[model samples]
Target chain A: ADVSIENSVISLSGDHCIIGRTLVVHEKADDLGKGGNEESTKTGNAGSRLACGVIGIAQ
Target chain B: ADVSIENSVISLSGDHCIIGRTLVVHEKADDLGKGGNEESTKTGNAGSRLACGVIGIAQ
Candidate 1:
């Protein structure tokens, strides 16, 4: 149930990450050892955002 | 090289599908034989949205 907003921020988001400057809500939770720090934001290898939108209502 | 918007629709987005009622630009292109039918919208098995957002500017 991790959720957050108020800025272009990612916290309480667990394994989610920022990639291509986009916030990718990971399909899995972030593992400790700083995996979520640069992995997702850099190479977009963090996994994938599933069923969350790319979120919200569509056009 | 695909893009579309105008309704709660999914088209020309290749392997992308609609899931969780949200537009999911699949990590891979649709494989034909109609894999993107209602499967994704039902089971969320279409793959994952990489960097396209869940789109636009975030909070």
Candidate 2:
């Protein structure tokens, strides 16, 4: 699929720099830590990973 | 490094669905297709991938 993520804010500075972190796409929706389930608090219950990428610096 | 992406929109429906795509993090900033270089147009000149993850649904 042709997915375009625009106008998004990914932190890469200060104590939150993610120069080598993993960006993951899951099989389900993220509950935003509000699902109240075991996995919800951990992963937003977003289900299994579908695809992933590493976070890097943007000029 | 620690990275956090919030309020980001990753499509997972219709023709724009990215259920099983590869998300890549580059070593440099993305030129937003304005770098006018060969690799820029292809990868926004974001340099080499640092890390990545897949996009998934949010519940």
Candidate 3:
């Protein structure tokens, strides 16, 4: 029951308001987009959806 | 460039419309509960987030 996203920052623009979308955490680390294999090119081969949740708006 | 979700159906209500949320596809098959691991209880050990997209509504 431990969760944390300390000191992380991301940027989005009003043209693409991502509110109400989901955020997914993967089991494996991202390959940074250059892996050569089919899965690598398409998905970075980032192995499995470990957790996810919806994005919410804050005042 | 081929994508398909033929003959799949899901149920949601207006109270939980989910139109603004996201749908994530995983890399592994779901454990369907009872894997006995920490990951199982939390996420069925579904390995890696392969792909995801935002939900949308159609008129």
Candidate 4:
């Protein structure tokens, strides 16, 4: 991941992440530019997801 | 990208890939570690996505 942030968080970003793999788009990161019927890659060239955690308080 | 293969393929693998981000699990990397309800990361700690193409023969 590109490692980006704003409030108080630790996550992956900037293009990719080492989360894992799948066989469906029922979570998040699956609707890029366009939707289905406009099919693309299996990596979800169709789309992918982002990551972040605990964004509370401005410490 | 990790640069891995086992035939004649050129794609990303290893520990990460930069295909982009999204909000779904409708490809091939959203059923890892366990499965939703099991709770995990968004990079799909439960899963993410893999990439590959054109292997229509025994090369």
C-alpha DockQ for predicted model 4:
0.06
Tell me each candidate's TM-score. Answer: 0.14, 0.14, 0.16, 0.13
Candidate whose TM-score is highest? 3
The digit string of per-residue lDDT tens for model 4 on B1-59 reads: 34333334334333434233432322222222221121223222233322221111111
- The order by descending lDDT is 3, 2, 1, 4
Better of 1 and 2 by TM-score: 1
Positional deviation of A29 in candidate 3, in angstroms? Answer: 3.1
lDDT of 1 by residue, A1-59 (tens): 43333324222312332224232332322221221211222223222453223322232
TM-score of chain B of each: 0.12, 0.17, 0.17, 0.13
The value of fnat for model 4 is 0.07
Best-to-worst order by TM-score is 3, 1, 2, 4
DockQ of each: 0.05, 0.06, 0.06, 0.06
lDDT of 2 by residue, A1-59 (tens): 44444568443322222232355432322222221211112222222321123222221
Stretches > 4 Å off in candidate 4: A1-36, A39-59, B1-7, B16-59
Docking class of 1: incorrect
Those runs of model 3 whose alpha carbons end farther than 4 Å from true positions after fitting are: A1-14, A30-59, B1-19, B23-59
> Across residues A1-58, which tens digit of lDDT does each residue of candidate 4 receive?
3433334423343443434343223323222322112222323222223222111111
Q: Rate the local accuracy (lDDT) of all candidates.
A: 0.28, 0.29, 0.30, 0.27
Model 4 chain B weakest 10-residue run by lDDT: B50-59
